[PDB]
Ligand binder design. Structure first.
Ligand SMILES: O=C(O)CCC(=O)C(=O)O
Ligand SMILES: [Mn+2]
Length: 199
């Protein structure tokens, strides 16, 4: 279905409760904000980061910054639960040398979406991206190298971890409007953690 992608469904189930406590802690220092894309449009997905570097939008485009543009303070440190879960996930996928220095935390409110894009702000594209889904289920869609390539759908549920390596690392991807509902741990939203080798 996807070359280089290792899907580990429900892998983060045991760590989930502590990951949500740590997202809330990260958010108390660097709050969730809906970033404004270079063209002047506010994204529906609320984001924040933890680690040495953090993904953000800017006037000139998209970049990794060691400073939070909103608080003007550094991003919070990468929590131990985050580091430990990512490490075990990457190792189980055949990447024991993967050491992330950036974790983009996405919050999806009901109806929130993320249109087709590529993750190409990283120095080494051979390095994977570890994605961890928490809360409400979402339909992830992926294509190919071009923007007009056929889209394939994949449901990502609570605890699902996918290590996007190989060819799948360069694929155009996104999230369809989050369907309304309830989850015992997140109430009415979905969280997604994307660990990156940004330095
Ligand atoms: O929410 C997801 O599962 C994907 C998020 C994503 O692709 C991104 O933020 O770069
Ligand atoms: Mn992405």
């Amino acid at each position: 279905l996807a070359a280089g992608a290792v899907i580990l469904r429900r892998f983060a189930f045991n760590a989930a409760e502590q990951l949500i406590r740590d997202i809330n802690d990260v958010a108390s220092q660097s709050p969730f904000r809906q970033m404004v894309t270079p063209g002047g449009y506010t994204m529906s997905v609320a984001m924040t980061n933890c680690g040495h570097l953090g993904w953000t939008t800017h006037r000139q485009g998209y970049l990794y910054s060691p400073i939070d543009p909103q608080t003007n303070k550094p991003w919070p440190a990468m929590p131990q639960s985050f580091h430990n879960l990512c490490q075990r996930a990457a190792t189980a996928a055949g990447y024991p040398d993967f050491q992330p220095d950036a974790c983009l935390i996405n919050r999806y409110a009901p109806g929130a979406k993320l249109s087709l894009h590529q993750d190409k702000d990283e120095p080494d594209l051979r390095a994977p991206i570890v994605s961890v889904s928490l809360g409400l289920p979402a339909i992830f869609q992926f294509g190919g190298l071009k923007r007009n390539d056929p889209l394939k759908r994949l449901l990502l549920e609570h605890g699902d971890v996918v290590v996007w390596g190989g060819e799948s690392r360069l694929f155009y991807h996104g999230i369809q409007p989050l369907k309304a509902g309830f989850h015992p741990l997140t109430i009415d939203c979905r969280y997604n953690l994307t660990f990156r080798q940004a330095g």
